[PDB]
Structures are given as C-alpha cells and as structure tokens.
Amino acid sequence: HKSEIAHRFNDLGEKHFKGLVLVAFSQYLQQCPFEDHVKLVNEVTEFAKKCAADESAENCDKSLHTLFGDKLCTVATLRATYGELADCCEKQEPERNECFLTHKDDHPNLPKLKPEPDAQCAAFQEDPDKFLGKYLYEVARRHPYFYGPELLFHAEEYKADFTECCPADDKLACLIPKLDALKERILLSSAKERLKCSSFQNFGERAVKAWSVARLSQKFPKADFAEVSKIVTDLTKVHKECCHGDLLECADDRADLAKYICEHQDSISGKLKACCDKPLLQKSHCIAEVKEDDLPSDLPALAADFAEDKEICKHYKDAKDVFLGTFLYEYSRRHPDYSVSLLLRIAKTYEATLEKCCAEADPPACYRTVFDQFTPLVEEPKSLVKKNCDLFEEVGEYDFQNALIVRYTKKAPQVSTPTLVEIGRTLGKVGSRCCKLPESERLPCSENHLALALNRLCVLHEKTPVSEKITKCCTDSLAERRPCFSALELDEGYVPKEFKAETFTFHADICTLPEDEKQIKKQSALAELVKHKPKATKEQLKTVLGNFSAFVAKCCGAEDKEACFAEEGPKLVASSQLALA
Ligand SMILES: [Zn+2]
Ligand SMILES: [Zn+2]
Ligand SMILES: [Zn+2]
Ligand SMILES: [Zn+2]
Ligand SMILES: [Zn+2]
Ligand SMILES: [Zn+2]
Ligand SMILES: [Zn+2]
Ligand SMILES: [Zn+2]
Ligand SMILES: [Zn+2]
Ligand SMILES: [Zn+2]
Ligand SMILES: [Zn+2]
Ligand SMILES: [Zn+2]
Ligand SMILES: [Zn+2]
Ligand SMILES: [Zn+2]
Ligand SMILES: [Zn+2]
C-alpha cells in the first residue's frame, strides 16, 4: 500500500480509528487533560481522511510510527508535564519508539474512578460522546499496556449500562452492580495483557509462542496442530504490535484473525458458534474469552509417540522446535486441568530428558520412562493450592489476605509496603475466585491468576529494584517463576527494620475513609510489624493486629475522636512490642 494510514482508516472505520488513536495518546501521555488529547485525535483523523482520499498527498506515505511519534513531539507542555519523555524526541526511529515505551508509568497513582451514579448520569446527559470518550481516556492512562481493541469493547459495555440504567427510578442499584463487575473485568484484562508484554520484553517471541501453543491447545483440543500453529503465529503478531504501540496494525490484524477463526470454526471448536455471528468488536472479544471445548473421544495415549517410538532422537534432531511444539500441543490439549506454566514446566523437562538420553548409549530404554518425571511436577502445585484453599475456607478473605501479607513480607522485606499490601490483597481475591470452583478448574485458576499477581510485583520491581533474589525470580524463567517465589524464605542475615513510632500511630482521619482504604491502612501496619519483628509468629501478629483493629473502632466511635487516638495510641504501641518479642 502507498499510504499505511489510508489502509488502516479504510479497514477500521472512523469511529474505531478515532477510539484507538485516543487510547494510544492516553497511554503514552497519561497526565495531560482530556480535551487536549481530543484535539490531537481530531487532527490525526482529519489527516487520515486526507490520505484515504489521496493516498499520494504529502506525509501520507510515512510510517505509522513516524507519524505518531512526530505528533507526540509537537505537543506544547511535553517537557513541562513529562520531563525526560521530551528527551526521546531527539532520537530517530526505531529508538524513539522504544524510548517512549520505556517511559510508560505502570503505577501512575491517579484518583480512584469511583462510580458516582447521580453525578455520572448528569455528565452522561450533558455530553454523551464525551462520556464514552472519557471512559477510554481514564482507563487508558491508568493502564498503559491495555489491549486497545479490548478497551473499545468494554467502553461499549459502559455506555450500554448507563443508557439502560439512568432513566430508572433506582438509578444506583441498576448501575453499581454492573459497574463493579466491569471494574473486575478491566483489572483482569489489564493484568493478562501486561503479562504478554512483560513476556516479550524479558523472554522474547519463542516464550510467548510456547505459552500460546499451550493455552490454545487447551482451548481448542479438536483443532489440529497446523491450525493451532497458524492461530498462534497470527496471534503472537497481534500482541507484539499491541505491546509495541502499533495500535492500528494490532486492531486490523485482530479482525483478520477473528474472520479466519470464524471461517474455520468447525475445524477449530463447537463453542465458537455463539461468537461467530456477532458484530466485529463483540466477535473478537467472544473468541478471546471462549470456554474450553470438549475433549475429543478418539485421542491415543501420548506414550506411543513420545516414550515408545524408537526413532525420537532422529525425530528430535531433524526439527527440534517443531517436534517439541508437537509434544506441547498433544500434552496441553489432554490436560485442560493443568495451569499453563505447569505445561511449560513439563515440556521443558521433556526437552532436557531427550538431550541427556540421546547423548547416552541407549536412548529408547532411557527415555521410555520420561513420563515418570512429570508425576512430582504435578503434585507440587496441587499441594500448594489445596493448602491455600483450606486456609481461605478456614479463615475468610480478609484474614487470608493478611496471612499472605505476612508470608510475602517475610520472603521479601525490602519490597515497599504499598506493593506488599497490593499483592497480598490481590492474591486473597484469587482465593475467592478459585477455591469455590471444581478441581478440574481450581488448579489452573489458582496458578494462572497467581502468575498475573507475580508479574505485577515483577513490573514494579523492574521500575524500582530492591532485592537480588526478586530480580532472579523475575528475569530467569517465566515457567519457573511461581516455583522461584515459593522457594523464597526470610534471610538469616536480614536486619530488622528500625522502629519508628509515627509508622504505627493512627489518627482520626482514618474514620472518614472508605472500608477498603481503612483496611489498607491496617494491612500496611501489619507489613510494617513484620519488617520490624520478622521472627514473630503469624499467631503473635494476628493478635496484635486484632488489638489495633479494636483500637481503631473504639476511637472512631468516641465523641472526642482525636483525644482517644492521643491517649490510647502509645499504650498499644509499647504493649505490642512486648507481644511480638
Ligand atoms: Zn500495507
Ligand atoms: Zn491503498
Ligand atoms: Zn474495530
Ligand atoms: Zn534500542
Ligand atoms: Zn483501572
Ligand atoms: Zn475483556
Ligand atoms: Zn519489545
Ligand atoms: Zn490477544
Ligand atoms: Zn512497531
Ligand atoms: Zn517415529
Ligand atoms: Zn481465570
Ligand atoms: Zn539470572
Ligand atoms: Zn491518619
Ligand atoms: Zn475494617
Ligand atoms: Zn520493637
């Protein structure tokens, strides 16, 4: 094509093209106010219309990267608001784009977008096109690596809720349930795509490929290997592009894959019929979130082709990567009950056994029992999940969260308290999600979502590194990541953090906070007790936090609140010292 911007405008249409460009600009520039990005989006779209009518007109032949990066660099207040981001404009492509990507903020710390139902409907009434457009902007800047086409879909969910619910009598009780369910979908989606970009950045395509091969084979067991290879190749490209900012190519390539999957749906999966007669946004999303199809009845034991076939060392020698992919395809489709990282763990073992056995004198007799090395690999995650789920059921979410905060704080006491509270809190929600499921679904829920939380920690750690052992767990191997964090224990040579009274001094401003923030304030205190007294047992810690809870409720009920906090605070501090000894 002469003009790639023409090609994408034609392919995507004005509305989607607009929506993506707004998401792009809000991810690279997370602070500048709404109306500013609206102007930029408008100018790009105007220019895109100039190029589709005349593919030959000036600047239309330039690359999407050149055009987008040039646009960012002509923003007034770029240096004033974004500081070092302006230094990226001195670089030429492709180093200019890498520079912008590395300055995206994963913890921008913006005001929590609370659902104010009466206040929102009035904004929805006054300016609806701005209301849909502002949702995209607010979610984009909060989540900079969020899958662009994915955000459009969820933005369409947001206006469908508000149009429906606003004119009813009970405006709030129609909305708050629907919006709080949307929030949890955004958090999960952001987490999933962030792991994809993290994977490219620290491991490359080959690791992303194995991950997708394994997941898609579970998703589509009836699909043949050539079909799975095709989708994987196509999908890996979509993610590289979305992860790299190529937001228009991302969306375009995604649509082509959806069309493809739907045109080959009998060959791929019976669960796709519902998806495949929907409008294109909804069709893409449905395919991405489709359930795992039924396991076909006619599958032969893996043993014949992978332990028993005598010519495997020749097979392995001729096409190493293609042959292990076959193994991974065949193993993953039979085991929808296994987590993805576990499947990669197993496949790594298979690869490594073939290297030692084919080097040895007699391979067929050696590798005949390679499947026996997987038995311990499966029992290990099964044990972890059982133990956490029995704990979660025994004690409830809040306490389970606190247990994890104590656990992870002991593992890595150099990590910041906000980060430790975030991980413990998130992992407790995972317990609510996964422990209630059947065992066929419980292991993979637990370990797949645990991988998301550990990636979040790793991403914050790459930003502001504090611990070598965390760095090793985050950089060494994606498959072995969860095992690596599990193997962390408190160091014998960790020096208890110095006591600061202010750190355990509460005030009456806690009383006017919402419960979630009230808890965070209390859970932060928990982490700080551990950092200060790392050899205190979980049972000593639970008792002292209980006394802090009683102190906070007592004084928040009192008529003179700040005088209560003043009298009772110091007493509780000094007795807690003796309690934690
Ligand atoms: Zn082209
Ligand atoms: Zn053309
Ligand atoms: Zn579209
Ligand atoms: Zn570079
Ligand atoms: Zn968010
Ligand atoms: Zn989604
Ligand atoms: Zn990259
Ligand atoms: Zn995707
Ligand atoms: Zn690119
Ligand atoms: Zn053979
Ligand atoms: Zn899940
Ligand atoms: Zn290393
Ligand atoms: Zn306070
Ligand atoms: Zn509370
Ligand atoms: Zn002390």
XYZ file of C-alpha atoms and ligand atoms in Angstrom:
596
model
C 0.000 0.000 0.000
C 1.187 3.559 -0.772
C -0.203 5.046 2.487
C -0.492 2.728 5.510
C -2.570 5.316 7.426
C -5.056 5.208 4.485
C -5.130 1.391 4.649
C -5.948 1.436 8.419
C -8.631 4.151 8.216
C -10.354 2.180 5.394
C -10.046 -1.097 7.308
C -11.076 0.119 10.797
C -13.540 2.963 10.070
C -13.664 6.471 11.589
C -15.229 5.507 14.909
C -12.811 2.727 15.758
C -9.853 4.563 14.275
C -10.714 7.532 16.497
C -11.182 5.344 19.578
C -7.810 3.626 19.104
C -5.870 6.860 18.473
C -7.393 8.270 21.713
C -6.291 5.157 23.621
C -2.791 5.360 22.042
C -2.291 9.004 23.033
C -3.637 8.442 26.567
C -1.238 5.512 27.201
C 1.903 7.369 26.052
C 0.744 10.638 27.729
C -1.019 9.687 30.988
C -1.219 13.167 32.688
C -2.369 15.743 30.042
C -6.117 16.530 30.483
C -8.959 15.077 28.392
C -9.763 17.977 25.960
C -6.087 18.181 24.819
C -5.957 14.573 23.593
C -9.360 15.175 21.920
C -7.659 17.878 19.759
C -4.733 15.576 18.822
C -7.114 12.692 17.970
C -9.112 15.074 15.736
C -6.000 16.246 13.844
C -4.808 12.663 13.196
C -8.295 11.654 11.937
C -8.520 14.742 9.656
C -5.108 13.849 8.219
C -6.169 10.181 7.881
C -9.194 11.314 5.823
C -6.818 13.427 3.630
C -4.721 10.313 2.955
C -7.529 7.803 2.163
C -8.939 10.198 -0.481
C -5.451 10.937 -1.828
C -3.051 8.042 -0.928
C -0.383 10.218 -2.733
C -0.794 13.551 -0.756
C 2.207 14.794 1.296
C 3.181 12.901 4.503
C 0.666 10.068 3.773
C 3.462 7.697 2.674
C 5.325 7.931 6.051
C 5.266 5.019 8.535
C 2.617 4.879 11.291
C 5.484 5.155 13.856
C 6.928 8.248 12.179
C 3.519 9.989 12.100
C 2.522 9.097 15.663
C 5.931 9.878 17.225
C 6.188 13.177 15.351
C 2.701 14.096 16.680
C 3.730 13.440 20.299
C 6.835 15.601 19.854
C 4.805 18.678 18.705
C 2.792 18.752 21.975
C 3.312 22.023 23.889
C 3.825 21.231 27.622
C 5.514 17.891 26.732
C 8.709 18.837 28.594
C 6.802 20.732 31.311
C 4.487 17.823 32.176
C 6.570 14.752 31.150
C 10.193 15.914 31.748
C 12.511 13.148 30.467
C 9.927 11.968 27.867
C 10.849 15.024 25.771
C 14.458 13.683 25.516
C 13.025 10.772 23.418
C 12.151 13.245 20.610
C 15.879 13.791 19.880
C 16.245 10.061 18.945
C 15.315 8.735 15.480
C 13.154 5.626 14.864
C 13.189 2.852 15.882
C 14.983 4.013 19.084
C 12.421 6.844 19.513
C 9.535 4.409 19.989
C 11.457 2.148 22.449
C 12.202 5.297 24.439
C 8.539 6.319 24.666
C 7.517 2.747 25.664
C 10.053 2.513 28.462
C 8.658 5.783 29.983
C 5.055 4.478 30.292
C 4.071 4.543 34.004
C 2.676 1.299 35.499
C 1.832 2.942 38.872
C 0.629 6.485 37.901
C -1.355 6.770 41.176
C -4.358 8.683 39.830
C -7.662 9.415 41.663
C -9.764 6.233 42.016
C -12.593 6.429 39.464
C -15.455 5.811 41.906
C -18.960 5.281 40.435
C -20.971 8.402 41.398
C -24.293 7.290 39.820
C -26.292 10.514 40.221
C -23.204 12.604 39.282
C -22.309 10.386 36.276
C -25.797 10.285 34.636
C -25.800 14.133 34.706
C -22.435 14.145 32.882
C -23.843 11.397 30.587
C -26.869 13.616 29.877
C -24.887 16.843 29.213
C -22.217 15.322 26.909
C -22.642 11.602 25.918
C -19.976 11.443 23.130
C -17.504 12.994 25.590
C -18.723 10.499 28.264
C -17.831 7.398 26.186
C -14.619 9.100 25.005
C -13.644 9.998 28.595
C -14.022 6.366 29.799
C -11.452 5.243 27.180
C -9.149 8.082 28.259
C -9.438 7.324 32.015
C -8.885 3.551 31.697
C -6.059 4.042 29.122
C -3.933 6.374 31.256
C -4.453 4.201 34.326
C -3.444 1.100 32.364
C -0.772 1.952 29.743
C -0.311 -1.526 28.126
C -4.048 -2.316 27.988
C -5.051 -4.099 24.785
C -6.508 -1.222 22.682
C -9.322 -3.101 20.809
C -10.212 -4.711 24.145
C -10.843 -1.261 25.676
C -13.233 -0.284 22.866
C -15.306 -3.406 23.612
C -15.502 -2.612 27.317
C -16.274 1.052 26.536
C -19.319 -0.255 24.598
C -20.277 -2.221 27.773
C -20.010 1.043 29.807
C -22.489 3.055 27.672
C -24.910 0.087 27.388
C -25.122 0.034 31.221
C -25.659 3.821 31.547
C -28.222 4.194 28.715
C -30.247 1.335 30.228
C -29.925 2.146 33.954
C -30.004 6.016 34.173
C -33.745 6.612 33.390
C -34.996 4.045 36.001
C -36.134 5.089 39.498
C -33.378 3.277 41.432
C -30.542 4.631 39.236
C -27.760 3.357 41.535
C -28.772 -0.289 42.228
C -29.033 -0.976 38.456
C -25.576 0.581 37.902
C -23.262 -0.162 40.878
C -23.592 -3.970 40.440
C -22.929 -3.624 36.672
C -20.018 -1.157 37.060
C -18.253 -3.019 39.872
C -18.434 -6.171 37.674
C -16.955 -4.132 34.782
C -14.110 -2.933 37.055
C -13.094 -6.545 37.858
C -13.119 -7.316 34.099
C -10.785 -4.331 33.426
C -8.360 -5.344 36.223
C -8.179 -8.921 34.967
C -7.816 -7.898 31.312
C -5.060 -5.377 32.070
C -3.221 -7.989 34.124
C -3.432 -10.618 31.316
C -2.164 -8.342 28.517
C 0.551 -6.870 30.779
C 1.948 -10.391 31.265
C 2.034 -10.728 27.454
C 4.139 -7.558 27.054
C 6.327 -8.474 30.040
C 6.962 -11.810 28.286
C 8.181 -10.221 25.022
C 10.349 -7.732 26.935
C 12.157 -10.232 29.223
C 11.977 -13.523 27.251
C 11.135 -12.877 23.538
C 8.696 -14.377 20.974
C 9.606 -18.057 21.472
C 8.419 -17.979 25.104
C 5.186 -16.204 24.154
C 4.724 -18.819 21.412
C 5.024 -21.765 23.808
C 2.650 -20.040 26.212
C 0.045 -19.529 23.432
C 0.554 -23.019 21.956
C -0.154 -24.473 25.395
C -3.189 -22.268 26.144
C -4.809 -22.514 22.691
C -4.387 -26.312 22.640
C -6.355 -26.455 25.933
C -8.901 -24.031 24.426
C -9.277 -25.902 21.123
C -8.466 -29.602 21.669
C -10.387 -30.620 18.465
C -8.110 -28.311 16.391
C -5.208 -29.966 14.565
C -1.583 -28.861 15.140
C -1.195 -26.991 11.826
C -4.326 -24.984 12.726
C -3.015 -24.214 16.252
C 0.350 -23.166 14.734
C -1.445 -20.803 12.340
C -3.559 -19.101 15.010
C -0.520 -18.887 17.394
C 1.667 -17.243 14.719
C -1.099 -14.766 13.806
C -1.950 -14.005 17.445
C 1.670 -13.540 18.581
C 1.997 -10.857 15.888
C -1.180 -9.103 17.135
C 0.347 -8.917 20.649
C 3.803 -7.838 19.598
C 2.104 -4.942 17.787
C -0.301 -4.022 20.624
C 2.517 -4.311 23.141
C 4.753 -2.180 20.919
C 2.256 0.635 20.371
C 1.418 -0.369 16.806
C -2.194 0.064 17.815
C -3.786 0.330 14.357
C -1.945 -2.750 12.968
C -2.906 -4.545 16.192
C -6.637 -3.934 15.739
C -6.564 -4.644 11.994
C -4.613 -7.907 12.371
C -7.001 -8.928 15.220
C -10.071 -8.508 12.989
C -8.444 -10.638 10.245
C -7.782 -13.418 12.777
C -11.393 -13.285 14.045
C -12.698 -13.580 10.487
C -10.284 -16.503 9.993
C -11.241 -18.337 13.198
C -14.939 -17.903 12.327
C -14.488 -19.103 8.726
C -12.707 -22.263 10.132
C -14.871 -22.802 13.235
C -15.956 -26.438 12.595
C -12.264 -27.304 12.149
C -11.447 -25.376 15.418
C -14.275 -25.542 18.036
C -18.034 -26.097 18.512
C -18.041 -23.428 21.250
C -17.412 -20.734 18.581
C -20.923 -20.753 17.011
C -22.265 -18.221 19.559
C -19.319 -15.852 18.929
C -19.205 -16.024 15.164
C -22.468 -14.308 14.174
C -21.800 -11.184 16.307
C -20.597 -7.685 15.289
C -16.819 -7.468 14.912
C -15.938 -5.932 18.303
C -18.064 -8.457 20.183
C -16.870 -11.310 17.920
C -13.162 -10.664 18.688
C -13.799 -10.482 22.443
C -16.031 -13.620 22.490
C -13.285 -15.645 20.742
C -10.663 -14.384 23.228
C -12.883 -15.339 26.212
C -14.325 -18.589 24.752
C -14.689 -21.625 27.036
C -12.541 -24.743 26.665
C -14.146 -27.151 24.165
C -14.954 -30.806 24.951
C -12.073 -33.271 24.804
C -12.453 -35.476 21.688
C -13.068 -39.180 22.405
C -10.550 -40.577 19.881
C -7.164 -39.459 21.293
C -4.376 -42.085 21.591
C -2.084 -42.330 24.626
C 0.828 -39.884 24.464
C 3.114 -42.806 25.495
C 3.125 -44.373 21.975
C 4.502 -41.340 20.066
C 6.687 -39.750 22.855
C 8.073 -42.529 25.134
C 7.707 -45.607 22.881
C 8.526 -44.543 19.243
C 12.141 -45.716 18.825
C 13.106 -43.064 16.223
C 12.646 -39.995 18.503
C 16.362 -38.985 18.602
C 16.261 -38.753 14.799
C 12.832 -37.013 15.035
C 14.177 -34.610 17.644
C 17.380 -33.978 15.640
C 15.510 -33.130 12.378
C 13.109 -30.484 13.771
C 13.786 -29.775 17.451
C 11.449 -26.781 17.854
C 8.668 -28.211 15.642
C 8.844 -31.589 17.448
C 8.624 -30.182 21.000
C 5.741 -27.986 19.832
C 4.025 -31.222 18.824
C 4.655 -32.614 22.329
C 3.356 -29.415 23.898
C 0.277 -29.409 21.621
C -0.558 -33.045 22.356
C 0.065 -32.783 26.126
C -1.791 -29.474 26.605
C -4.997 -30.489 24.792
C -5.366 -33.583 27.049
C -4.889 -31.532 30.235
C -7.300 -28.587 30.456
C -6.942 -29.277 34.214
C -3.277 -28.088 34.283
C -2.049 -24.466 34.506
C -0.116 -23.045 31.566
C 3.202 -22.532 33.408
C 2.978 -26.174 34.588
C 2.570 -27.345 30.979
C 5.671 -25.332 30.041
C 7.498 -26.783 33.091
C 6.649 -30.321 31.875
C 7.658 -29.588 28.262
C 10.979 -28.130 29.474
C 11.590 -31.454 31.305
C 10.773 -33.458 28.177
C 13.272 -31.337 26.150
C 16.009 -31.722 28.774
C 15.487 -35.520 29.143
C 15.867 -36.055 25.371
C 19.185 -34.125 25.467
C 20.644 -36.436 28.179
C 19.119 -39.706 26.822
C 20.041 -39.140 23.121
C 23.600 -38.310 24.292
C 23.717 -41.607 26.270
C 24.442 -45.027 24.702
C 20.832 -46.378 24.657
C 18.054 -43.725 24.232
C 14.855 -45.877 23.743
C 15.433 -47.653 27.091
C 16.430 -44.335 28.749
C 13.538 -42.115 27.594
C 10.956 -44.944 27.912
C 10.252 -43.585 31.466
C 10.379 -39.817 30.719
C 6.657 -39.530 31.682
C 7.543 -40.643 35.232
C 9.424 -37.324 35.755
C 6.121 -35.374 35.435
C 4.422 -37.046 38.449
C 6.310 -34.933 41.032
C 5.859 -31.765 38.906
C 2.021 -32.078 39.037
C 1.677 -32.981 42.758
C 3.659 -29.877 43.835
C 1.202 -27.172 42.537
C -1.714 -29.416 43.641
C -0.358 -29.308 47.216
C 0.083 -25.505 47.256
C -3.495 -24.898 46.070
C -5.035 -27.401 48.497
C -3.185 -25.722 51.425
C -4.193 -22.140 50.438
C -7.825 -23.077 49.691
C -8.168 -24.955 53.013
C -6.727 -21.830 54.684
C -9.040 -19.457 52.783
C -12.076 -21.629 53.675
C -10.878 -21.994 57.303
C -10.449 -18.188 57.874
C -12.188 -15.984 55.204
C -10.799 -13.451 52.708
C -9.540 -10.541 54.876
C -7.552 -12.868 57.193
C -6.296 -14.913 54.239
C -5.035 -11.662 52.697
C -3.290 -10.785 55.963
C -1.723 -14.248 56.109
C -0.319 -13.712 52.603
C 0.937 -10.221 53.524
C 2.873 -11.740 56.435
C 4.090 -14.532 54.147
C 5.317 -12.270 51.316
C 6.749 -9.609 53.691
C 8.954 -12.276 55.301
C 10.035 -13.504 51.828
C 10.967 -10.007 50.654
C 11.042 -7.372 53.435
C 12.989 -4.869 51.280
C 9.958 -4.508 48.938
C 7.800 -1.451 49.597
C 4.797 -1.736 51.909
C 2.250 -0.495 49.325
C 3.443 -3.209 46.895
C 3.297 -5.968 49.561
C -0.239 -4.903 50.522
C -1.290 -4.917 46.821
C -0.004 -8.489 46.249
C -1.458 -9.962 49.471
C -4.785 -8.256 48.774
C -4.905 -9.377 45.120
C -3.940 -12.974 45.977
C -6.735 -13.189 48.548
C -9.252 -12.241 45.840
C -7.789 -15.105 43.766
C -8.820 -17.414 46.670
C -12.425 -16.152 46.424
C -12.326 -16.662 42.675
C -10.726 -20.102 42.506
C -11.337 -22.132 45.705
C -15.112 -22.335 45.035
C -14.535 -23.969 41.592
C -14.375 -27.727 40.751
C -10.869 -29.344 40.975
C -10.748 -29.745 37.164
C -10.827 -25.880 37.093
C -9.281 -24.964 40.501
C -5.566 -25.611 39.941
C -5.394 -23.673 36.658
C -7.456 -20.751 38.033
C -5.188 -20.521 41.101
C -1.825 -20.776 39.294
C -2.753 -18.728 36.179
C -4.058 -15.812 38.265
C -1.133 -16.181 40.707
C 1.191 -15.699 37.700
C -0.594 -12.396 36.970
C -0.030 -11.106 40.503
C 3.653 -12.137 40.487
C 4.078 -10.320 37.152
C 2.625 -7.174 38.678
C 5.179 -7.384 41.512
C 7.976 -8.019 38.956
C 6.941 -4.977 36.871
C 7.022 -2.678 39.927
C 10.364 -4.175 40.880
C 11.965 -3.527 37.443
C 10.881 0.116 37.883
C 12.473 0.444 41.388
C 14.703 -2.617 42.169
C 15.484 -3.512 45.826
C 16.353 -7.261 46.064
C 18.657 -9.516 44.036
C 16.570 -12.614 44.816
C 13.430 -10.867 43.438
C 15.395 -9.865 40.303
C 16.474 -13.511 39.796
C 12.889 -14.795 40.124
C 11.649 -12.126 37.682
C 14.377 -12.406 34.994
C 15.460 -16.084 34.995
C 12.494 -18.030 33.594
C 8.772 -17.442 33.103
C 7.835 -21.118 33.583
C 9.862 -21.412 36.816
C 8.696 -18.031 38.203
C 5.995 -19.253 40.607
C 8.287 -22.024 41.971
C 11.021 -19.386 42.433
C 8.827 -17.118 44.585
C 7.631 -20.141 46.586
C 11.259 -21.076 47.375
C 11.903 -17.607 48.903
C 12.288 -17.629 52.697
C 13.292 -14.978 55.249
C 17.074 -14.337 55.197
C 19.065 -15.292 58.325
C 21.006 -12.044 57.760
C 18.015 -9.725 57.297
C 18.430 -6.828 59.746
C 15.121 -5.978 61.473
C 13.996 -2.541 60.266
C 14.408 0.297 62.790
C 11.355 1.194 64.890
C 9.584 4.463 64.015
C 6.587 5.402 66.196
C 4.824 7.510 63.533
C 4.623 4.344 61.371
C 2.232 2.751 63.983
C 0.457 5.975 65.056
C -3.122 6.196 63.736
C -5.311 9.335 63.609
C -8.988 10.322 63.349
C -8.665 10.903 59.580
C -8.869 7.081 59.228
C -12.507 7.205 60.463
C -13.714 9.186 57.423
C -12.115 6.720 54.918
C -13.980 4.017 52.978
C -13.527 0.446 54.253
C -11.114 -0.617 51.532
C -8.732 2.233 52.393
C -9.330 1.639 56.123
C -8.143 -1.964 55.649
C -5.139 -0.970 53.537
C -4.076 1.415 56.300
C -4.357 -1.516 58.798
C -2.706 -4.039 56.459
C 0.167 -1.592 55.860
C 0.680 -1.556 59.617
C 0.752 -5.387 59.515
C 3.548 -5.429 56.894
C 5.492 -2.898 58.971
C 5.201 -5.058 62.118
C 6.734 -7.961 60.170
C 9.539 -5.836 58.682
C 10.339 -4.710 62.234
C 9.800 -8.111 64.002
C 10.357 -10.748 61.261
C 10.621 -13.684 63.723
C 7.199 -13.024 65.297
C 4.869 -15.911 64.501
C 1.762 -15.387 62.403
C -0.241 -16.068 65.626
C 1.558 -13.226 67.506
C 0.963 -10.912 64.525
C -2.760 -11.747 64.246
C -3.245 -10.967 67.965
C -1.505 -7.574 67.743
C -3.393 -6.544 64.594
C -6.620 -7.566 66.349
C -5.770 -5.137 69.141
C -5.095 -2.427 66.523
C -8.495 -3.148 64.941
C -10.121 -2.784 68.379
C -8.234 0.455 68.998
C -9.305 1.969 65.652
C -13.022 1.055 66.113
C -13.053 2.234 69.760
C -11.616 5.673 68.948
C -13.655 6.123 65.726
C -16.807 5.590 67.824
C -15.731 8.075 70.540
C -17.242 11.604 70.798
C -13.759 13.189 71.033
C -12.019 11.039 68.415
C -8.568 12.674 68.205
C -8.281 12.786 72.033
C -8.967 8.998 72.147
C -6.317 8.340 69.478
C -3.937 10.541 71.523
C -4.458 8.713 74.860
C -4.796 5.087 73.731
C -2.218 5.016 70.867
C 1.133 4.926 72.802
C -0.154 2.262 75.252
C -0.974 -0.081 72.383
C 2.411 0.531 70.737
C 4.541 -0.382 73.788
C 2.442 -3.489 74.689
C 2.672 -4.662 71.056
C 6.484 -4.566 71.368
C 6.322 -6.979 74.307
C 3.687 -9.082 72.486
C 5.846 -9.543 69.362
C 9.078 -10.396 71.249
Zn 0.404 -2.072 3.535
Zn -4.446 1.596 -0.669
Zn -12.945 -2.166 15.089
Zn 17.122 0.363 21.107
Zn -8.277 0.565 36.473
Zn -12.400 -8.112 28.158
Zn 9.794 -5.139 22.596
Zn -4.923 -11.163 22.132
Zn 6.196 -1.100 15.542
Zn 8.571 -42.025 14.541
Zn -9.175 -17.314 35.072
Zn 19.722 -14.832 36.196
Zn -4.134 9.215 59.760
Zn -12.380 -2.785 58.689
Zn 10.230 -3.034 68.530
